[PDB]
């Protein structure tokens, strides 16, 4: 091809800009034009398309968010919506599309590929639950955002006020919670992929206080429930003064870490490789520390899993 | 004197360790022994007191929290508890005491003063609400913690969700909200020291969205109310989707900034000087960029104010 | 005035964008148009001037550098260049100018007013070497960039690698080295405003080694000499393995701190006020924690000093 | 086993503490005692050994450096030193040893196991140059320390100073330069394991300047040469004013990132598994995103490689 497109969909994820830059620079390296599609599939339908020159991706590698923005598009979840998008692409001479985002963005890539239009998905989300990849672009940064709060809370502990609950992001996936929990020394970590007994949790807390543990940190995935509630719940059971922090959308913002920028650079470039090799209808990723790509439809068929051993370890280390 | 003591009281505040380091090193420079009193006034009464060698304040200048710990002491709001405190100090040959902390800590210093025991209060709290000083040790660091969040939230904006409420600490004082609001480009800042009108808050918000402002950030001092309630009010009046972050006790943690460390170092040393100069019942601070000290009880009678011109400015810049 | 201008000159400084935002928003608040002048005085002469809208300073408050750029303009140090700048200001309808920069940029401000253009100077530099102001915009941020380095070095000490030299910026002023050094717990701070003796420096190293100090940290202002040279002289003199960091232009970069964003906002706005008050040939600053403005020539005739007490304190605390 | 020991050796690496914590807590969980050996093998030989209790590794997970300290020991490279080391182990009833560090530490582990003393190596260094692992503990943190510096330099690019050399660590290994280069959008990266030619470096500089690239960032691995030297060469050849940053031991310092803490936690715990299950003469690692262990002698026989595709990619993208 002579001309490709690029968009971002889903919530913002640190590293999207690193991925947009990789896509533009890799394409341009092979003499291919790249056109930016703004506001995701909404902007595609609306015709928000503009050429991205080599310098237009300068000074964005280190920047959070996305210069192409992100928007919801229930219209594109329909055939009338998909139809107008293909029209806008044909109109601007765009022969393939790189889509960067979450579970949502991949369905649109699937549907465009079903309608014969070459499209490759790039995993851009903080929650780590996109198939075809061990890690999504944004996950590493979000974990470092979480542990920055955990580390500050460790300075604020007292003998009376020593129990803390932190509510982290992750729709449906416990990856942020598990990994940030391990990295932050959390005693208890509540995730959708592992059963928890609140009595087992209360016992742990009392055993730790009894042996002189300065403080206890409990991490709660938003997909298990509310931390504000687990906080109230733990107080009146144990009598222990419990402070709850709800981190929220700070977890999607910030400059990406080194790994997120590298992952983004490598996966963006691979998305372009696939489109130029005439291999649309795929998604890219890293698996077992190797770059990979898969059919989107097959990849999406896979259920998300977490490392149960890591969950067990985190319990062991926090005695 | 041959020997003095130091302790920390109130919540944790970044720079408390830089303060402790300075009291210890300044005293030792003049050939005076220093004894740490652990757990604030509670450990004072309990006799939780241990000599600090030169020695023991190494590699703490950059560390958040307090190595001496902080605790609550209702007992020390009583004559009986003050006398047990003075007896433990005598018991250990401590001739003067430096108290680093909040208003709680100052009240005890005034009481020890009424009792004839030389004490100097040093302002260690994040909320800036201590008299005899323009700035308290921990305040600058907290501002930077708040703006880290605000900055990350900017990257998160969409058309869908462009309206954000952040609830910051402050207790009764709007300093953290005012200063972090201005630094963060907050559209509205709700503080105890200045009236607000919710319809004017709503009017500015729509006026901003109109003229294409990418997002509105609203900062709420916890002493004004709950971010959750304000975000609801705003979502229910405008229809705009409103996301609330409540930062919490993360604000009291972290490594202190340069300014907090400098201030802590200067005020700590100055506090020891006053003891050795034969004073007591003073509190130290920085006012008009000069080091100052004042009678504790006189200072405590002053009401806290904020810069109202800065508040007006913050409004003017967010159009 | 119907229309003013704003430019940045000298080196980049954290908070230049906050100051530009404030000038633009403060002018626009009062019904005044604001035109951006790109590339400093060079751009003024070349006519690189573009109106700035309310939203053009959206999402810059938190960014380092300057969206207007800076360039060196020798053409402006002479009388033909200056009046070049003048035809371009009249051609674009610009009745007054805010110059955000260092010392050199003020000179152009002075000369311009004489030719009937009110100009107000705003202090934007990391060096802290401008008269009429206790602090310059970017200084606090530079200090926190330096202590970041010092803090990390504190983790790295061993028995053999125990002595560290870090070279900091500041031009001919010792403020960065002094304040960084106090905040970072430096044992020796070499600055142009204070005598030092390499024997005493070496005496201090040995005293610290003999008493069990884990490491010794040496801060060298660039105005005094080369960190690499000092490090090598220490290792040659003592046999002590000495490690050298030279931070360089990193100190001019990064997101401004809370204090730099506030000072930038207050000072930028003040400049616009002066222009609308009918004043010109002034520069703004903060002195004794109060906003001030001075005649540019008067201000420039003053000599910059550091606080010798803070220098002596740094000695006394690092025993 | 009923007693093991743990030790740190080589330069400090962010995450060594997380690893120490993991070894202590994993052992204690299985009812095994852990003794800390202070100052590496030097301290082992001197008998600088002290029981580590559950809580003694409290509040270290998030801390840079090593609480056990690190020291050089050439004597441990001799038969006598191995003899005296084993005598101290036996005297203290230590039945196996975990060594956390670099090559020096692994050679010591090999020798120990040839002397029939069980020992497991854990990879702890910033430079990623340890066999049996794709990543060493500290590498990811060091990368983030480097890009902080690169990010800040991006803010400072003037028109007459837009060429920057940054010297990074990695003697022998180009991993830091390569990964931080790619993550940082470096135009040129000089590493030991890929060929460079100054003619290409200068051509690339000029080629980017003509196209309107705002700045050129050159990353030089210290194993290739001196940044100060390369900077001079570039300035002298091109007349482009070139500025130089040598970060130095800053790269070994700071709080570990999430990935380093997770890696340290998983690898420390595995070392304990091997010792308790009667293994020894092994090292642990993560390869292809899977926890692995190897015979130390076999792993040491492997040459270090970097990913050549990543290097090629870094050039493609920085046009």
Curated annotation (Swiss-Prot), chains A, B, C, D:
Keywords: Allosteric enzyme, ATP-binding, Cytoplasm, Glycolysis, Kinase, Magnesium, Metal-binding, Nucleotide-binding, Transferase. PROSITE patterns: PHOSPHOFRUCTOKINASE (PS00433). It catalyses: beta-D-fructose 6-phosphate + ATP = beta-D-fructose 1,6-bisphosphate + ADP + H(+). Its EC number is 2.7.1.11. The active site is at 127 (proton acceptor). Mg(2+) binds at residue 103. ADP binds at residues 21-25, 59, 154, 185-187, 211, 213-215. Homotetramer. This is ATP-dependent 6-phosphofructokinase. It comes from Geobacillus stearothermophilus (Bacillus stearothermophilus). The lineage of its organism: Bacteria, Bacillati, Bacillota, Bacilli, Bacillales.
């Amino acid at each position: 091809m002579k001309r490709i497109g690029v968009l971002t969909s889903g919530g913002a994820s640190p590293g999207m800009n690193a991925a947009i830059r990789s896509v533009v620079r890799k394409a341009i390296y092979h003499g291919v034009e790249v056109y930016g599609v703004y506001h995701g599939y909404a902007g595609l339908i609306a015709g928000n398309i503009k050429k991205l020159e080599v310098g237009d991706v300068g000074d964005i590698i280190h920047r959070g968010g996305t210069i192409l923005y992100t928007a919801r598009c229930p219209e594109f979840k329909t055939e009338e919506g998909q139809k107008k998008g293909i029209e806008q692409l044909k109109k601007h001479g765009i022969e393939g599309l790189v889509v960067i985002g979450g579970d949502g963005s991949y369905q649109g890539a699937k549907k465009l590929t079903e309608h014969g239009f070459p499209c490759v998905g790039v995993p851009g989300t903080i929650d780590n639950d996109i198939p075809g990849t061990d890690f999504t672009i944004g996950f590493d940064t979000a974990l470092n955002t979480v542990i920055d709060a955990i580390d500050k809370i460790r300075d604020t502990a007292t003998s009376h006020e020593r129990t803390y609950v932190i509510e982290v992001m992750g729709r449906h996936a416990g990856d942020i919670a598990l990994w940030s929990g391990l990295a932050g020394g959390a005693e208890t970590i509540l995730i959708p992929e592992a059963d928890y007994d609140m009595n087992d949790v209360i016992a742990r807390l009392k055993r730790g206080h009894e042996r002189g543990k300065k403080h206890s940190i409990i991490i709660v995935a938003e997909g298990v429930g509310s931390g504000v509630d687990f906080g109230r719940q733990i107080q009146e059971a144990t009598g222990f003064e419990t402070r709850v922090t709800v981190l929220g959308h700070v977890q999607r913002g910030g400059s990406p870490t080194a790994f997120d920028r590298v992952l983004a650079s490598r996966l963006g470039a691979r998305a372009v490789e696939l489109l130029l090799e005439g291999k649309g209808g795929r998604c890219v990723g890293i698996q077992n520390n190797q770059l990979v790509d898969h059919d989107i439809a097959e990849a999406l068929a896979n259920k998300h899993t977490i490392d149960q051993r890591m969950y067990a370890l985190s319990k062991e280390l926090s005695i």
